[PDB]
A paper describes a structure:
Respiratory complex I is a ~1 MDa membrane protein complex with key functions in aerobic energy metabolism. Fourteen central subunits are conserved from bacteria to mammals. The energy released in the electron transfer reaction from NADH to ubiquinone is utilized to pump protons across the inner mitochondrial membrane or the bacterial cell membrane. The electrochemical gradient established by redox-coupled proton translocation drives ATP synthesis.
A cryo-EM map of complex I purified from [name] was obtained from 124,626 particle images and refined to 4.3 Å overall resolution. Four lipid molecules were identified in the membrane arm. In contrast to bovine complex I, we observed continuous density for the loop connecting the first two β-strands of the 49 kDa subunit and for the TMH5-6 loop of ND1. The C-terminal domain of accessory subunit NUEM, which is supposed to have a regulatory function in the A/D transition, was largely modelled with side chains, whereas the corresponding domain in the mammalian 39 kDa subunit was disordered.
Residue numbers in the entry:
A (entry chain g): 4 to 63
B (entry chain 6): 2 to 184
C (entry chain X): 4 to 120
D (entry chain 3): 1 to 34, 49 to 124
E (entry chain W): 63 to 121
F (entry chain L): 1 to 86
G (entry chain D): 2 to 81
H (entry chain 9): 9 to 67
């Protein structure tokens, strides 16, 4: 049986996800976290501001 | 005033009574059995003092992890114990420990506030006598929070959190590279 | 924007790597710092061979060999990264004076034009 | 008082009760007839158990007040989890037992 | 919480009269206890002149 | 602050007069780090919200790694796992 | 078909916790009077519910029925 | 690194003393500083209470 | 109470143990009566000796018999 | 031991207040808001400006801001008595889950804005507000069994 | 004062009588699952076997010269006191609105489920047998390694909660049926839940006669019924704890009881009924959960310690750290964070 | 840019074939390029030594601390070259030890300080027993661990009392509090003696020394120098107690006598361990100062380069012995290296100039370390401590010259037939040439630190 081998990355991700896949599908979640966290600044398109508060002491 | 519920705070007598066991045990591990009793008495103290949160933290992480790890080691490669505090092993004990207990009592006295005398040494021992603190009422506390403010400070002082990330990193890499012995 | 009235203070120039937040300050900011650069943008390229100069540092690691094998890629990454920090160490400043000061020519105008933030 | 202190006080006495029932009426009459070894994976598992507990203790106030730290506590804890997950990618490479005796080399003749 | 903050002056003023009326009355009680020998009951412990709260009371 | 100084001092001079059992010394040195927190927590309670209790959660998280390195180093007080020796 | 015997222990394991929940509900409405029960709104009912105890029992809507401000409570406790 | 304290109210009137450089006047902050100290430990409060209970003891 | 639960410990030496585990078979089930045997001579009540008994076994059998409650 | 101190006196230099009543004022919380808001603001402003110098806004604002709330609760005890009463009666159950009585809310608010012509201005422009008719949310569990007939009849008669 | 002690007696007799008949229940359902019939003979119907077995196995009580009685006479009482019973101090949704618990729920349950582990370890410490205590260290090691990934997942499901008192999770979860419908890692919680309270398909330290004809120590007598009752009670507690947070209490027919109680009762007749159906909801969410424990008892065989540590420290835990690289991420992305 | 280097090469040591002699070449060249392209912060460093603070708790003092971390980088580059050119997988924790040391040289406030001293100490506990197939290291590591634990809780108890008297933590808030409540002084000397575990002040004396002789020589170079500079650089960066108010002066009196009275030693490691102890005791004397850091900043480098140098010289002297000691530790006796001048006597010349360094003959080091030390002393007025420092220098010079007098007597039978062992020779030649040519540029630094 064959492990993963780096030098062909399109091949590596294949024969990682097919022979020792159980860390692949973890790290797919690990890349779905922050990369999708960077594809939101257009995707919220200024959706909402939460607007919470402690006590509003006002001005003169 | 529910007479015992006022001296339920003074549980320090059980603390010193457990710690006098903790250094004179029979077996090497009946001591660390008593150590978790020391920690749960500390948790009882912290719940009584107004912070049950850190009581439950100590129950979760000290007798949940590190005392479990003391018991975990003391099964395997058990060290050769001297039997107990024999009188020949209580030799040169009193002759320095009495003076050391006196000097450390004076150190606890040196934790006192500002007096350049021995008056502050007696002042902290009478600290409960002239005083019982007065609580107050809620002036504009909007949201309920006990350890939430701890994380607020952990956001303000974020850099020590990102550095104790490194100390937990060391806590896992060290025991790899000191016991695994790669081939 | 993007957060509350809380503030994040960071005037960072050290050996522990940091960055900047969205905005509220007078010092160097996050996204403007990668821009307003110069022809020193190949300074990160100058390090890009320097950690790839470890092959030149190989004066007989083993006996009678050279050209350390293809982990130089890793070195190349570090040859980028430190130099990137060195490019990010080219905070000339954010709108101070008494320096090279192209910021009053290439970033005074942006603070002029963007008159709504 | 009066709420659950009754439970944590009643229960030890119930434990001593169902213990101390049969200490008396069970027949005893006790007649007669009534260093070590190791592995790295028997020890390093519990050693490395502890830091991954108390990083959860680190994470627990953050998950208590996830709010009041918006857009920024997320960033800090993502950096914290990055610094921890690289420790995980260190320890994935090594921790397993090794079967000592299984040989396969080809056989030669003169 | 907005609901609660609209209640927040009111309730605090509910206490404030109390922390006027509890404070000076305690001081008057101690005027009765410390009379005879001249003494600084009628004196702030805090050297800044601004009103504080009494604390650490013996019951 | 009697409650923390007394357990600290007794752990300390237990660590002095410990002519038996290396691990009782080791756990007395552990219990120093919870004799100090009973000082720290009640000083924070007598003061305020989170100023010293932040240092308390720090010293708990770090006392874990203390005991971890102490065990994983005490394992190597000898040869490793087990062989012939003397 | 279904096991007529085997679901009888599940029937009593259902009924025991069922009666155990109903008894908690009854004993808390008898504890509190004919109302539901409050959760921990920490630091806040000890302003609010304590104030209700300083005035009345249960709840009331009026102007004020205090006397010596209905005897303003002040908590005190020993030094640690 | 100073949460919403029960002694925060004496930072400002200590720090506004050290707003100007009167820590090199070296005494202008000492009323402010020891009022900060009495917020910390209530020492002269406690001596005042010990005095009045000693007067209580002689009746 | 003693007559109801009634669990043994298997000693189970030969063919007669095959019939003993046929009593754990679904046709003539043990658990319709309560017989739920543990593999431990202290947690046991009765000690079914099944199979033939060698000369070699018998001290082990009596040692099992002694570590068994009254 | 959290023992209670319960001393008594009365201090001279001002006219005494009138206190307020129980947790049912949580129903009336917005109702004192828009009316007594500048009184509130001037009170807390005068408190914050006198740095440490409390106990001097008592005679001006500590009396004034309570006078306004006493006036508001007297107006609501004459205007919508039982409409207030069933609403806080709902609201003392359900843990003061203020979502948990949002149908008798509309009855009480319509009655107030009818007779005492106030509102509930929750400040913030982005979302929708008090009429939500929830539709992905945590509406109620026990839907105020003495009060569902009330909002049903208000849908019926009005 | 009198009402709460009769409250606590009702709740204790519920849990004790419950865990008594639970063993008969599981043996019956194994038996029908094993194509036979369970205890069908005891006394009056056949619901009574454990209730006679408890009186049976009291009256044995041996001690062993290889071990101090002072530890093993108390260590199964330890896990009987703490692991079994005072886990119910949190009143793990005592299924109404109300509880017998003040507040600060989930990490108390964490602390006591953590506290049981050296109750197992010191139990196995006994008798000084060089083949025994290594098996004890095995048991406790796998026990803590799955404690960790109970812990690190029910702290991440409360990231949709952020409030640490017990009820607020439950009132939060009634809108979505939040528990499993938004996330199916319930199942790995379930496969974590068989390990940290080992009534498992793992059976791992129950190498019953692979050792010298004894597995744990064979501390038979009152410590046996203590260990037995505490294991089953830890099972129904952690099963309730599953039905507490990551499976839901407060079934949606009580949400629809707005369309039912308003058609049934007039106005608050002593709250007579709703706590009962709420208890019915939580009970049927709890026993249907442990029916899968009684499945997995008799479906898949033991699980091979080295592969068990493989199953902890290699697969489930990095999937887990991915899964709370996204549940902070995805709610931050989609709209926003939760308040408290 | 150290954290990025750590997280990079912990991933690089993962999935490595345990060659593990190349990764240090990458770390050496990476620290070299990082210093070469990160020295550009010296222009933005100081107009008038303007400090810069990270988030209120961390301090960047651009004249002092920006030189200290440059020295740390320098000696780390030297150690990393010393492992190149017998090893296990360890440079990850070398770098994180550096991270801790640099945090304590940048730590404004005690939370960062305590985290980082404990991180640093954990690194020392680990590095002591990486070479786990020893009986020396096994004992020494556990001894270092237990006493570092005692001294750690001494740290934390000092600062907890400091918090008990003042609700702040920062020494920035100490701000010349001249009413000087006496417990503030006692807390501060307790914190001083707590941080002074590493110097092994004469009541805390012996325990470090058995640890130094029970580590391999490739390790005892590293931890006779890292915390030696680290905790003291913190201790001079903030001047805790302006004078001693006789507490610390007594500690250094019994040190600089009672560690130089440790004269007769036959073990090499003990000998230069006492050397590195007493020369660390030297720079404690200007912990007793105020507004004085130039002598300290110069004395660190103009000691530590030569300390590194003498360890590298007795590294080179393994090749010439005709006996060795244990697998981990080659050369422990002085009398092992007898006739070294009849071997390659250029290194005997280097050993000569770096020991004449430590005795302080004028034209290379001692008239620029000890001269600045003595002018900092006699600026304050500590007249007695001057003459006891002089006695310390003479009696230290005696066992210093013990090494040169055993170095160049006469060889029994060894001259010459060999192969070569080089390309790290430029490191030792760089340290020796910078030792004996600092008298050239001994005035440029005097202007540069006058402008910083
Ligand atoms: C999404 C697309 C991204 C495109 C980006 C485009 C931008 C262009 C920039 C160009 C630079 C390229 C950067 C890529 C670096 C990838 C590293 C690599 O692949 O080296 C392979 C190499 C594998 O070793 P090998 O011996 O050559 O392969 C042997 C076998 O074939 C077996 O080899 P293997 O395949 O099994 O290797 C295992 C590897 C899996 O193999 C992979 O590389 C898959 C990773 C795919 C990319 C995901 C990571 C990139 C995301 C950004 C960096 C996150 C970290 O697992 C990991 O190493 C995980 C890395 C850490 C992730 C957590 O790794 C190394 O030897 C060491 C290199 C590590 C240097 C990188 C350090 C940078 C990390 C930055 C962290 C920032 C921390 C900030 C903290 C701030 C505190 C205040
Ligand atoms: C975040 C935490 C979640 C997972 C991280 C946990 C560790 C994963 C890293 C890892 O396991 O790498 C090692 C593995 C090969 O290691 P191995 O050879 O088995 O070593 C054993 C030798 N005894 O290497 C592997 O094969 C497992 C890692 C595979 C994952 C590779 C990256 C997948 C991510 C997909 C995004 C790729 C980015 C480019 C996408 C193209 C553009 C759309
Ligand atoms: C994507 C959108 C959503 C995003 C959120 C994602 C949430 C998803 C929910 C969680 C994901 C589920 C992950 C399940 C983890 C299980 C992984 C696993 O078991 O790996 C198999 C592994 C095999 O062993 P090994 O030989 O080492 O594998 C290498 C082979 N080359 O290990 C093993 O040895 C197998 C042992 C498993 C033991 C299980 C025993 C029976 C359990 C069945 C009872 C559960 C059924 C009841 C609940 C179901 C309710 C519907």
């Amino acid at each position: 049986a064959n492990p993963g081998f780096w030098n062909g990355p399109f091949r590596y991700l294949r024969w990682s996800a097919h022979n020792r896949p159980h860390l692949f599908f973890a790290f797919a979640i690990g890349i779905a976290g922050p990369v999708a966290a960077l594809t939101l600044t257009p995707l919220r398109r200024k959706y909402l501001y939460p607007d919470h508060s402690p006590l509003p002491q006002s001005y003169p | 005033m529910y007479l015992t519920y006022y001296f339920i705070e003074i549980t320090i007598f059980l603390a010193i009574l457990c710690t006098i066991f903790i250094i004179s045990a029979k077996n090497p591990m009946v001591s660390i059995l008593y150590m978790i009793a020391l920690f749960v008495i500390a948790a009882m103290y912290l719940y009584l003092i107004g912070l049950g949160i850190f009581s439950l933290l100590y129950i979760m992480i000290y007798i949940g992890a590190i005392a479990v790890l003391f018991l975990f080691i003391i099964t395997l490669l058990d060290i050769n114990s001297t039997e107990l505090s024999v009188k020949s092993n209580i030799r040169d004990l009193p002759l320095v420990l009495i003076s050391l207990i006196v000097l450390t009592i004076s150190g606890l006295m040196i934790y006192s506030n500002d007096s350049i005398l021995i008056n502050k040494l007696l002042e902290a021992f009478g600290n409960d006598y002239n005083t019982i603190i007065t609580q107050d009422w809620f002036n504009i506390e909007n949201t309920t929070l006990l350890t939430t403010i701890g994380n607020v400070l952990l956001t303000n002082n974020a850099f020590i959190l990102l550095v104790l990330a490194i100390v937990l990193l060391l806590g896992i890499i060290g025991p790899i590279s000191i016991t695994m012995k790669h081939k | 924007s993007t957060p509350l009235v809380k503030t994040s203070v960071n005037y960072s120039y050290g050996d522990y790597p940091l960055i900047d937040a969205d905005p509220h300050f007078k010092r160097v900011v996050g996204y403007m710092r990668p821009s307003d650069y110069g022809v020193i943008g190949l300074a990160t390229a100058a390090l890009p061979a320097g950690i790839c100069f470890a092959e030149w540092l190989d004066p007989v690691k083993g006996k009678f060999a050279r050209p350390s094998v293809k982990f130089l890629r890793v070195a190349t990454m570090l040859g980028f990264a430190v130099g990137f920090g060195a490019a990010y160490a080219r905070s000339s400043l954010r709108f101070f004076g008494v320096t090279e000061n192209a910021r009053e020519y290439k970033k005074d105008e942006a603070q002029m034009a963007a008159r709504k933030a | 008082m009066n709420t659950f202190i009754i439970f944590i006080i009643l229960i030890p006495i119930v434990g001593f009760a169902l213990l101390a029932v049969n200490i008396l009426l069970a027949v005893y009459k006790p007649y007669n007839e009534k260093r070590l070894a190791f592995n790295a994976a028997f020890i390093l598992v519990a050693i490395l158990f502890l830091p991954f507990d108390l990083e959860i203790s680190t994470l627990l106030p953050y998950v208590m007040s996830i709010y009041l730290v918006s857009n920024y506590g997320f960033t800090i804890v993502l950096l914290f989890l990055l610094i921890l997950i690289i420790g995980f990618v260190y320890e994935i490479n090594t921790n397993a037992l090794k079967i000592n005796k299984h040989n396969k080399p080809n056989t030669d003749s003169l | 919480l907005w609901a609660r903050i609209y209640l927040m002056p009111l309730l605090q003023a509910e206490e404030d009269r109390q922390t006027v009326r509890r404070s000076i009355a305690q001081l008057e009680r101690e005027k009765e206890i410390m009379k005879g020998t001249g003494f600084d009951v009628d004196k702030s412990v805090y050297n800044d002149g601004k009103f504080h709260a009494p604390a650490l009371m013996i019951p | 602050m009697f409650i923390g100084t007394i357990i600290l001092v007794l752990s300390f001079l237990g660590f002095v007069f410990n002519r038996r059992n290396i691990i009782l010394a080791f756990i007395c040195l552990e219990t120093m780090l919870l004799g100090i927190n009973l000082i720290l927590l009640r000083n924070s309670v007598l003061f305020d919200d989170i100023s010293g209790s932040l240092f308390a959660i720090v010293i708990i998280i770090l006392a874990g790694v203390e005991s971890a390195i102490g065990l994983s180093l005490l394992v190597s007080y000898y040869r490793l796992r087990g062989v012939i020796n003397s | 078909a279904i096991p007529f015997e085997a679901l009888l222990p599940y029937g009593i394991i259902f009924g025991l916790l069922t009666a155990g929940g109903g008894a908690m509900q009854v004993l808390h409405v008898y504890r509190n009077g004919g109302v539901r029960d409050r959760f921990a709104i920490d630091q806040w009912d000890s302003q609010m519910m304590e104030r209700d105890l300083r005035l009345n029992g249960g709840q009331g809507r009026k102007q004020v029925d205090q006397a010596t401000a209905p005897e303003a409570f002040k908590h005190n406790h020993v030094w640690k | 690194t100073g949460g919403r304290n029960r002694c925060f109210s004496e930072w400002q009137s200590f720090m506004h003393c050290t707003a100007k450089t009167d820590a090199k006047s070296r005494a202008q902050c000492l009323p402010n500083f020891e009022d900060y100290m009495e917020c910390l430990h209530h020492t002269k409060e406690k001596a005042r209470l010990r005095e009045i209970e000693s007067v209580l003891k002689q009746k | 109470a003693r007559q109801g639960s009634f669990w043994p410990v298997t000693f189970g030496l030969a063919c007669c143990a095959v019939e003993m585990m046929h009593v754990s078979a679904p046709r003539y089930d043990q658990d319709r009566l309560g017989i739920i045997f543990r593999a431990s001579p202290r947690q046991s009540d009765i000690m079914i000796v099944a199979g033939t008994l060698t000369n070699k076994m018998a001290p082990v059998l009596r040692q099992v018999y002694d570590q068994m409650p009254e | 031991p959290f023992e209670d101190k319960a001393n008594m006196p009365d201090n001279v230099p001002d006219v005494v207040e009138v206190g307020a009543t129980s947790a049912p004022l949580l129903s009336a919380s917005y109702f004192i808001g828009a009316k007594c808001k500048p009184y509130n603001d001037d009170f807390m402003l005068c408190r914050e400006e006198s740095q440490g110098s409390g106990a001097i806004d008592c005679l001006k604002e500590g009396r004034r801001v309570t006078r306004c709330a006493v006036s508001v609760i007297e107006d609501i005890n004459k205007s919508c008595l039982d409409e207030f009463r069933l609403h806080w009666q709902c609201l003392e159950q359900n843990n003061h889950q203020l979502s948990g009585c949002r149908k008798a809310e509309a009855l009480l608010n319509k009655c107030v804005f009818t007779k005492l012509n106030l509102e509930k201005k929750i400040p913030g422009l982005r979302p929708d507000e008090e009429p939500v008719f929830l539709k992905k949310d945590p509406w109620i569990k026990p839907a105020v069994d003495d009060f569902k007939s009330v909002r049903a009849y208000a849908e019926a008669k009005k | 004062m009198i009402i709460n002690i009769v409250e606590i007696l009702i709740f204790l007799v519920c849990v004790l009588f419950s865990v008594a008949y639970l063993t008969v229940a599981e043996r019956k359902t194994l038996a029908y699952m094993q194509r036979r019939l369970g205890p069908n003979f005891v006394g009056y119907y056949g619901l009574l076997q454990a209730f006679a077995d408890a009186v049976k196995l009291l009256l044995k009580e041996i001690v062993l010269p290889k071990e101090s009685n002072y530890i093993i006479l108390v260590i199964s009482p330890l896990i009987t006191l703490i692991t079994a019973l005072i886990g119910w101090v949190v009143i793990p949704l005592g299924p109404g609105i109300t509880l017998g618990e003040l507040n600060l729920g989930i990490l108390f349950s964490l602390a006591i489920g953590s506290l049981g582990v050296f109750g197992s370890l010191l139990s196995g410490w006994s008798s000084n047998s060089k083949y025994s205590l290594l098996g004890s260290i095995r048991s406790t090691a796998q026990l803590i390694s799955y404690e960790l990934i109970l812990t690190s997942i029910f702290i991440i499901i409360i990231m949709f909660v952020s409030s640490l008192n017990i009820t607020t999770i439950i009132e939060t979860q009634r809108v979505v049926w939040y528990c499993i419908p938004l996330l199916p890692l319930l199942l790995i919680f379930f496969i974590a839940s068989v390990a940290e309270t080992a009534r498992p398909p793992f059976d791992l330290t129950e190498s019953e006669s692979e050792l010298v004809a004894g597995y744990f120590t064979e501390y038979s007598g009152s410590p046996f019924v203590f260990f037995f009752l505490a294991e089953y009670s830890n099972i129904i507690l952690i099963s309730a704890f599953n039905g507490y947070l990551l499976l839901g209490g407060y079934l949606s027919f009580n949400y629809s009881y707005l369309f039912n109680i308003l058609f049934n009762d007039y106005s608050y007749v002593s709250f007579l009924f709703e706590g009962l159906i709420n208890s019915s909801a939580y009970a049927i969410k709890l026993v249907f959960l442990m029916f899968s424990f009684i499945w997995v008892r008799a479906a898949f065989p033991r699980f091979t310690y080295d592969n068990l540590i493989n199953f902890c420290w290699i697969i489930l835990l990095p999937l887990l750290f991915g899964i709370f690289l996204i549940i902070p991420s995805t709610l931050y992305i989609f709209d926003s964070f939760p308040t408290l | 840019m150290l954290i990025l280097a750590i997280i990079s090469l912990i991933t690089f040591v993962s999935m490595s074939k345990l060659s593990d002699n190349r990764a240090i070449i990458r770390l050496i060249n990476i620290y070299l390029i990082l210093v070469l392209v990160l020295d550009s912060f010296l222009y933005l460093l100081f107009l008038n030594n303007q400090t810069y603070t990270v988030m209120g708790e961390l301090l960047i003092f651009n004249s002092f601390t920006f030189y200290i971390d440059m020295l740390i980088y320098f000696i780390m580059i030297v150690i990393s070259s010393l492992y190149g050119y017998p090893k296990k997988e360890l440079i990850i924790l070398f770098l994180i030890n550096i991270l801790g040391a640099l945090l304590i040289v940048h730590s404004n406030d005690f939370i960062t300080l305590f985290v980082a001293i404990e991180l640093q100490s954990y690194s020392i506990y680990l590095i002591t027993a990486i070479y786990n197939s020893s009986y020396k290291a096994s004992k020494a590591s556990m001894l270092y661990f237990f006493m570092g634990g005692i001294l750690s809780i001494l740290i934390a108890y000092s600062i907890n009392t400091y918090y008990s008297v003042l609700n702040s933590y920062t020494l920035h808030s100490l701000d010349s509090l001249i009413i000087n409540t006496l417990d503030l002084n006692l807390i501060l000397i307790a914190l001083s003696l707590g941080l002074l575990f590493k110097i092994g002040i004469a009541p805390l004396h012996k325990w470090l020394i058995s640890i130094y002789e029970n580590t391999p020589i490739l390790i005892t170079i590293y931890i006779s120098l890292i915390p030696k500079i680290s905790i003291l650089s913190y201790l001079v960066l903030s001047n805790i107690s302006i004078n001693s108010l006789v507490i610390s002066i007594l500690a250094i009196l019994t040190l600089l006598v009672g560690s130089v009275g440790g004269l007769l030693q036959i073990k090499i490691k003990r000998l230069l361990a006492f050397s590195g102890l007493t020369n660390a005791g030297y720079m404690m004397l200007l912990l007793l100062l105020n507004n004085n850091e130039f002598s300290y900043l110069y004395y660190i480098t103009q000691y530590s380069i030569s300390h590194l140098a003498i360890f590298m010289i007795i590294i080179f002297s393994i090749y010439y012995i005709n006996y060795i000691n244990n697998q981990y530790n080659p050369i422990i006796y002085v009398n092992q290296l007898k006739g070294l001048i009849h071997d390659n006597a250029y290194l005997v010349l280097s050993m000569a100039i770096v020991v004449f360094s430590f005795i302080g003959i004028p034209p290379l080091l001692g008239f620029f370390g000890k001269l600045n030390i003595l002018m900092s002393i006699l600026n304050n007025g500590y007249y007695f401590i001057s003459i006891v420092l002089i006695v310390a220098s003479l009696i230290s010079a005696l066992y210093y010259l013990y090494l040169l007098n055993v170095s160049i007597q006469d060889k029994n039978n060894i001259l010459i037939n060999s192969n070569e062992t080089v390309s790290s020779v430029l490191s030792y030649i760089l340290s020796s040439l910078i030792i004996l040519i600092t008298f050239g540029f001994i005035y440029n630094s005097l202007i540069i630190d006058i402008f910083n």
